[PDB]
């Protein structure tokens, strides 16, 4: 079974794959969510729009994309394919 992953391999990719259809879908999924997160942080001081900044407990200075991928792991997001 998956032993405690570390660094860039966490969360396990194979568990993310079941939350999407193909690897490419996960790429864009996570990238768009990361743009949303970075945008919340960047313009949090002013009147944030529909951007829902972090949803899973953010790390102290967790990189945006990492928060996004973890959110996808916890089934905290939804997507509509092209």
């Amino acid at each position: 079974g998956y032993d405690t992953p570390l660094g860039i391999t966490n969360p396990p990719i194979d568990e993310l794959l079941d939350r999407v259809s193909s690897k490419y879908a996960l790429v864009i999924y996570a990238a768009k969510r990361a743009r949303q997160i970075n945008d919340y942080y960047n313009q949090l001081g002013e009147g944030i729009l529909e951007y829902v900044g972090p949803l899973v407990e953010p790390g102290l200075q967790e990189k945006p994309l990492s928060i996004a991928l973890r959110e996808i792991h916890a089934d905290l997001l939804e997507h509509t394919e092209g």
Binding site: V52, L55, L76, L77
Partner: peptide
């Protein structure tokens, strides 16, 4: 929607 409300 569920997580959005949970924010």
């Amino acid at each position: 929607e569920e997580a959005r409300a949970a924010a």
